[PDB]
């Protein structure tokens, strides 16, 4: 115990210097991950918007083409 009491205290030192910095890093990843899951929904709406817009321009294109089926026929 002449140097065996300054070996159990430096073993509880890096079990608090590691365990904590792991949790501060885990929380960084998990903060960034929720920010990632966030950008994933902004996009799955921004797209779903543009899609239901594209379905309207395809409906107009058929009506402009049906208007053409008569106004361009012999």
Tokens of 44: 């799955």
All domains in the chain, ordered by first residue: 1-74 (1.20.5.170)
From the CB of residue 65, how many other CB atoms can be counted at a distance below 10 Å?
A: 10
Identify how the structure was determined: X-ray
The resolution, in angstroms to one decimal, equals 3.0
- The contacts of residue 64 (CB under 8 Å, 6+ apart) are none
């Amino acid at each position: 115990l002449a140097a065996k009491e300054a070996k159990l205290r430096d073993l509880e030192d890096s079990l608090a210097r590691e365990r904590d910095t792991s949790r501060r890093l885990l929380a960084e990843k998990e903060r960034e991950m929720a920010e990632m899951r966030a950008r994933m929904q902004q996009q799955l709406d921004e797209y779903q918007e543009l899609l239901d817009i594209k379905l309207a321009l395809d409906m107009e294109i058929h009506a402009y083409r049906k208007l053409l089926e008569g106004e361009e026929e012999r």
